[PDB]
Design a protein around this ligand. Structure first.
Ligand SMILES: Nc1ccn([C@@H]2O[C@H](COP(=O)(O)OP(=O)(O)O)[C@@H](O)[C@H]2O)c(=O)n1
Ligand SMILES: Nc1ccn([C@@H]2O[C@H](COP(=O)(O)OP(=O)(O)O)[C@@H](O)[C@H]2O)c(=O)n1
Lengths: 245, 241
């Protein structure tokens, strides 16, 4: 069972032009993700999928593997489907190019889940959040059954707090593991109404009846979208280098 | 494939004591539901499951069949499980005793769905509602997939309207059809966190991984919970003559 990690890294970004190239403790952001991806046991290769030559050059400059993809891609999943035809594997893991604080152990949990159940098509991550955080539409909530299979993903607070003290919220962490066959049949899937309404691409899979198992992990580090969080990542990243002395 | 209709009708109610016996244009509410249930093709028997002797006698008075059940049940679903042991069938349809405006056609759609797919454990109904109506916590929303299987039931407006013009809403209509095996295993199912938070008993089934197919019908008539709704139903059933 061969598994590879693909890191989609688009340059073009509105509030952060050239986001993967931003410096964090002397290295571009994309490098931090790549270095951490390399620490994941059981992975054969790590690739960076991009549509911009400046990102491809930055990646090659530190010796990483880069693959140019079409710029007409509407999402990180469509970009992964194109990489799938060229890079062979049984399990593809999609890592965000803008989350430099990813824990290698969490990706291993995801990979072990896939290997422990050959019938599982897709696997993703989640962590507990408070009711106050769950109120934000920018945060994606998920509700699961006893087998930890996702029932639904939403920007609306789910479950609804009728009996508030009984509610427990789970935040969806955008890291995915796909079986090869799911990606091969992906482009044939039509867009769903819930997907278009919520603007959550993962609902396209749920519409087609494709099961998505969600594994729970500890609260993850802050991502990078706002320059307010960027400074916290830099200080948090630097604080980490001094701790491991 | 024997199918039976069970109408849970306890005497008590916080807002309308003795609800099943309330008069609606000459007949107690329970009789209206029972008579409409009798118009459903493909059903072998119709039973009223009750906890009170006054309800039982009223049903027998008009010629219907009634069965006494325990008074300690918390839901009509639990009451149905007790009946399943006494009345043998392959498919059990659970009708609300306080929804006298039920269309026999809608119950037939539900029954046909169960018969068209032997693997289907549970089936229920739903109908389109506006975005304004979906915002109400008292209205239960449901989201389905291409095969019309429910993904989740919630009091929250789902799907979330990020792109408002793309969102389409469905309201869950509390009528259910259960395969016998589901009812035999019901008492073993643990309550779920989502069930307790939302206060929706059907989430106990989803938690256990039991599939629930949702069939779409036209907007339904109002139920009778408050004395205000009772006056509206009386008016609606009067002009319907
Ligand atoms: N059309 C797109 C959109 C996102 N992506 C990538 O997929 C991940 C998730 O994107 P995102 O939610 O942070 O939104 P943006 O990165 O586009 O600002 C990032 O690594 C993106 O660069 C992509 O490769 N192609
Ligand atoms: N403990 C209970 C609660 C409801 N029910 C029945 O289930 C149906 C719907 O009840 P409901 O929960 O929606 O509202 P209530 O009738 O309980 O006030 C009615 O026909 C009730 O008589 C029951 O048989 N036993």
């Amino acid at each position: 069972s061969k598994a590879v990690i693909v890191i989609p890294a688009r340059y073009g970004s509105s509030r952060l032009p050239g986001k993967p190239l931003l410096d964090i403790v002397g290295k571009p952001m994309i490098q931090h993700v790549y270095e951490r991806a390399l620490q994941v046991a059981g992975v054969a290769e790590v690739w960076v999928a991009t549509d911009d030559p400046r990102v491809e050059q930055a990646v090659q400059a530190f010796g990483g593997k880069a693959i140019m993809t079409r710029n007409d891609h509407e999402s990180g999943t469509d970009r992964l489907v194109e990489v799938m035809h060229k890079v062979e594997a049984d399990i593809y893991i999609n890592l965000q190019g803008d989350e430099p604080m990813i824990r290698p152990r969490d990706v291993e949990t995801l990979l072990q889940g896939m290997r422990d159940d050959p019938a599982l098509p897709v696997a993703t991550l989640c962590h507990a959040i408070s009711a106050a955080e769950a109120a934000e539409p920018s945060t994606v909530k998920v509700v699961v059954n006893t087998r930890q299979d996702a029932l639904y993903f939403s920007r609306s607070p789910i479950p609804y707090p009728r009996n508030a003290e009984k509610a427990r919220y789970l935040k969806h962490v955008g890291i995915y593991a796909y079986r090869r066959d799911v990606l091969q049949n992906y482009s044939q899937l039509p867009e769903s109404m819930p997907e278009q309404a919520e603007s959550l691409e993962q609902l396209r899979l749920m519409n087609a009846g494709i099961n998505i198992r969600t594994f729970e992990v500890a609260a993850t580090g802050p991502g990078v979208d706002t320059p307010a969080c960027l400074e916290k990542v830099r200080a948090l990243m630097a604080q980490e280098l001094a701790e491991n002395a």
